[PDB]
């Protein structure tokens, strides 16, 4: 609104504890190039070559562009992670507030000789926040562009593309759709202007920030025996025999809980090199499903125990355990030393080992001359009477995923984490309006493809409100809780972790996750 | 409060049938000797010797003992209990008031000779009832030490003790717990104090107390015939061939609904002997689930039925059908004679019998040359459209248990029984203080290890408030209800079932279920 | 707010006298480069090499940049100081108030050929007042980058660098701390905005602005004599002889107070040469303490007068005395006549000379056979019943000092001088925001390094309000005052002292301490 002169807005970053509630709030500063040179071209691969058939997609470009804010690292630093999960147990979102201001538009011109970028006072910029959540919406597929971790870097906003049905080939079909999205309602920006919008979510369960103390296995005073009776053989004649189940074996109680369902997942040591088989195939011993002729990864799947205690160092699961990057990278296959793999020995109480394979079933009919036989079950599904915890959310890792819109579902929430929604925050798509290059003299009735080069460029800041839960636990010694154990660092090479390397980089030293306190079952 | 000559409270016992509720009251008697000299071990079993390395525990002792009623024949007779599941078809708990009274406290002098007990004025009971659930809760274990059946006789409270988590070979870890119950606030009760509480239940829903005079595989007008049609094999040709399902054939009809899912649990015949193979392991034929490592019994599992209509008499599960004690006995290994064996005919409307393993689907794609071949499965679980029946709640079982606090849990019922609760009565714990003795002259920094041996006891009442469906059935003729059958008993050995015998026991002749009414599904 | 036509602020410079206390207020333009090219560095430098083991250090670099105003010579001019120092015989802060306006920020591109700088209307810098005094305090240390004395030149304001602790060789340790500036609220300004804060000082003493006329030694009428009696030896038998104090001899006087401790500092004569040593070693010769392994230079240590009465001229103490330069200038070994060098006579009643090492105290035990000794020491420190005088502040030295924040400390004032303060003024940070240059066409994840080359400018005032103490003395004979005496100066060459030169930079004569008035003890 105001002039070119005034400021549309200042920054604001800080978090403040009120109390069960905390409000974190920041602010970065983004570039926006112009993509496609204003073109929605089709985009498709089919399975003839390279990867292979069940790579095939089809879909759509966009000359516009969005924000993707979801990830926990944007919202908090380090410092305050460490503040949040040492003492509290449990968080939510309740509302956010985005505005985006300060924007400047500057058009480059080339001489060949050199570039020359001189601002321009009147152009606009397109933005708009879609509501109704008629387009297809992209985030929640844990892909890159979001916001950097350390507020001061500048970053690029990523373009926006879909994937719709396809038939064979990766061709188009009749249900396939095509979205233009000149056709929604959106607002312009010009050089004194800002957007403000405001949301507020859904009611949530609180995400269980605790460790477990206890086992469903051991859930009994070991002091005493059951009043329950229970089977302990026959006789050599075929006469039943009974035993009651005592301190001395407690492995024999009847138990009112089961523990969590599963499906096998192969191991594999990351530390050890002498425990892993030579040269096994990522992309053949992975589990798979499949879907309309063709399948695809599932990963992580259903949550499992990384390790449980006891267990030999380095003891991981295949493809069943988020892994990080120190810092955003584009290399396709990062060495060992860049990794941040995470692990889950907090659950190990509810859920199983994920390679276990320990549960048995008996598979005949016994009778006069045939002895009963039992065998292991790969794969064992939900029951009534099982319990289970969910993965872990980590700093690194995704807030929400988009809960698809279908007729059923069974406990949503994401394998990979976080909260899962009915209405997740609204998509806020931003480009920046063309401008078309001196026209011919005479009429042209086809339309004008020759624009001025130009980016766009501002400041956007994001506020978001969370609510915790503080807790009372009377257990006597000390609860562990999350330090930083680095001995020593050389300025001239790594610097501090989490701080700033000595080439300017910012890097993310190891990963954390939300549960280190120890509540009993 | 009041002095040592009046009393500080009164005996109540009566049940009285108010409506659509009834309320249950009954006192007794209760001693508590002293526990481990006032001391606090640790406890622990390592895999090394005996049973074996799935039998490891680790944990704590502790001074404290505390009140166990949960079992519903404590709150019920005999007769009442006929009374209830005769005309009524569902109950659900409601509140309970609980309190204990007239503490006396008595010390005891051996002079090696004999010993002497003389009744001391002035000593205290400590007692407190624990709100927020910060101990951990060893009630539904199914573990002894519960309120005698019957209330003449006079019983002792357990030792309360637990178990955390476990390293390897039984030692403890990093999230291991250890709570200092004098850190806890209490009320001291001397003679002439009482202490009250209570308590009101979360909504619940009614336990269906009713047997089922239908079936799943027949919903149907057995008159008619379908107007959908079903493929009743293919041509010589290659063709494919209808068919329409008519009373003829009653398996064939598309059915909206499906039965409950399953896993495969051995069979074994109680009564009949020449049915059993012989010498079987009760271990090594048992349904287990693994967890950290090691693998614990599965028992009684998801309910299936024992027995169905027509089936061989004493047709039975292993492990699969809860076992209880004719009266309350310490024997590890009892006769069959002693035990009250229940089983399940009332569930087998919907639910399939345990061992039957029918299920079938299809193992291959058919196409020329080859053809479709179908399988048996061991395993079944749950898929959307199944319909289930909880087991039964017995006179004799238990009537809560804790929902442990999870992430998720899949309708949450407990498999042994009863009405599963997020917040369940809390656990009451008592101990009578320490008092030293005869300290020496000079002073010790040392702490004192020497105290006066004593004991104490008191009467404790509970009073439940229960809420029950009475219902009306249009059926024409009469359903089974719950009848004392036996012919003749001898006072000269066992007296009168459910009564007193010879010798003065308290004996419970056979097991009583809740479901004799039938009612359609 | 206003637009880009209208001035933001005018110029404000005056130094009313309105009574009790005085306002100063000045204006001056200010220039802030790019610094880091928006990058955080680690800097360390270990003691291999170079310096010494002494000399390592680690911390961090900033983009931002800051305002030091704290020096004497910013707020006064040659005259008004001289107005206050000969009337009045005291002053301290009482609040400021200062602003920043007339922003503007311009673009410099280079062709190869030259370089073109061409005004940027739309960019923005963003600056705050920290309050909570969260960032390290590098005020105080008496680095260069304060403002001008004179009000015409402009100046460059200094990057912002901390250092944290470290360990051996200087490397980073877990103490270590990593402050990320933009974690910060701040303010944009953009051209026609500007920046207003505000301050008030807390409860000081005033500084003392008087030389003292006597001294302790003589606090006493010299024609009397004192009513105590005291021992003026031995008899050669053993007895003890009395002597009483008279006008005959006045250092015999029994005295209530006690002059200043002191720590032995080496004497060195800057004019005279023929008294000095050859070549000594100033690093070698110089009062040190050690910290953490190391040890730093102790300068100027506590106070100590230069020289006597009486004493040889150019007699001074070794790093006792401040010194300053005739103007601003890098080199870093100035000649003798380029450096005022700063002299203590004003407080010689109370402190002692430096290097004089006269007290005295007894070493052993008499008694027949040993006769007593005594012996000089290097060191004394305080006991009850000392007094001493704090260091002067000259119109070149620093205002005032952060009392660093630790459990204790004993009479807090500045060992250079000034006003210790608890709460001092707030450190003010600016830095220009980043614009970047043209992204490529596709999205790139990583961050983007390549900025377009910009500096600020603009104006800056400060408004001091001081509180004066105005005072009477008897005396009858005139005082000292402070005056201008050099004779002549050629216009060709050094122009008027405390004015412009020949070659246009402004030169400060000679330095001028506060105390100029007599006042007894």
Redesign the interface.
Known sequence: A??????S??????TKWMGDHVITKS?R?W?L???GNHLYGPINFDGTTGSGANAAYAGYKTPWGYFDFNRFHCHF?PRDWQRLINNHTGIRPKGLKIKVF?V?V?E?TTQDS????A?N?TSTVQIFADENYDLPYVLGSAT??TF?P???????L??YAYCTLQGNSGKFVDRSAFYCLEYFPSQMLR?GNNFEFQFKFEEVPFH?GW??????????????????????????????????A?P????????????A?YECIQNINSSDNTKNANSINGSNSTNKWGLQGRQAWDAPGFVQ?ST????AAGQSLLNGVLTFDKS???TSSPAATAVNRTIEDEI???N??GN?R??????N????????T??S?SQ???????????RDIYLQGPIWAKIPNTD?HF?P?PRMGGFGLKHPPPMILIKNTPVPADPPTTFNPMPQTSFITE?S?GQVTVEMLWEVQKE??????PE?QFT???G?????VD??P?????L?TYVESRPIGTRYI????
């Open positions: 105001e002039g070119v002169g005034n400021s807005g200042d920054w604001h970053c800080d602010t500063t570039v190039p112009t993509y630093s300060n400047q500057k480059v050199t570039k020359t970028i601002n006072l890159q562009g950097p350390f507020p001061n870097d500048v970053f690029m990523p373009q050089t269980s460790a477990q103390s206890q086992s469903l296995d051991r859930l009994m005073n070991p002091l005493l025996d059951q009043y329950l009776i229970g089977d302990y053989g026959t006789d050599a004649s075929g006469n039943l025999i009974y035993h009651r005592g001395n074996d407690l492995n024999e109680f009847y138990k009112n809980w089961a523990p369902p125990a449980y205690e006891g267990a955003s990278a584009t190990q109480g509810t199983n080992f276990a320990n549960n048995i079933v008996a598979i009919q016994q009778t006069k001359g045939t002895n009963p039992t065998g079950t064992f599904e939900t029951m009534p009477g099982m319990v289970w915890s969910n059923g406990h929430s980016y460029t009372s636990s009377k257990r006597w010694n562990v930083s154990n680095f020593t660092s050389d300025p001239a610097g501090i989490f701080g700033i390397n000595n300017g120890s509540k009993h079952l």
